[PDB]
């Protein structure tokens, strides 16, 4: 089934294009991906 039930997650993920740019740029720690 669509194991992708997490919603605020998918949005966050879809919006993680930033949080990723943050760590990778400022810090560099984004393993939750």
UniProtKB/Swiss-Prot annotation:
Annotated knockout phenotype:
Increases cellular levels of glutamine and alanine during high hydrostatic pressure (mechanical stress). Sensitive to high hydrostatic pressure (mechanical stress).
Segments spanning the bilayer are none
| Protein's cellular compartments | Cell membrane; Vacuole membrane
List each copy of the FATC domain by range: 1-33
**What exactly does this protein do?**
Phosphatidylinositol 3-kinase homolog, component of TORC1, which regulates multiple cellular processes to control cell growth in response to environmental signals. Nutrient limitation and environmental stress signals cause inactivation of TORC1. Active TORC1 positively controls ribosome biogenesis via control of rRNA, ribosomal protein and tRNA gene expression, and rRNA processing.
Subunit and interaction comment: The target of rapamycin complex 1 (TORC1) is composed of at least KOG1, LST8, TCO89 and either TOR1 (TORC1-A) or TOR2 (TORC1-B). Interacts with PIB2; following activation of PIB2 by glutamine or cysteine. TORC1 binds to and is inhibited by FKBP-rapamycin.
What further note is attached to this protein's record?
Answer: It may act on another substrate or phosphorylate a different position in the phosphatidylinositol ring.
| Name the UniProt record assigns to this protein | Serine/threonine-protein kinase TOR1
- What part of the entire protein does this chain span? 2438 to 2470 of 2470
């Amino acid at each position: 089934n669509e194991l992708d039930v997490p919603e605020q997650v998918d949005k966050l993920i879809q919006q993680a294009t930033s949080i990723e740019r943050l760590c990778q740029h400022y810090i560099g720690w984004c393993p939750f991906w």
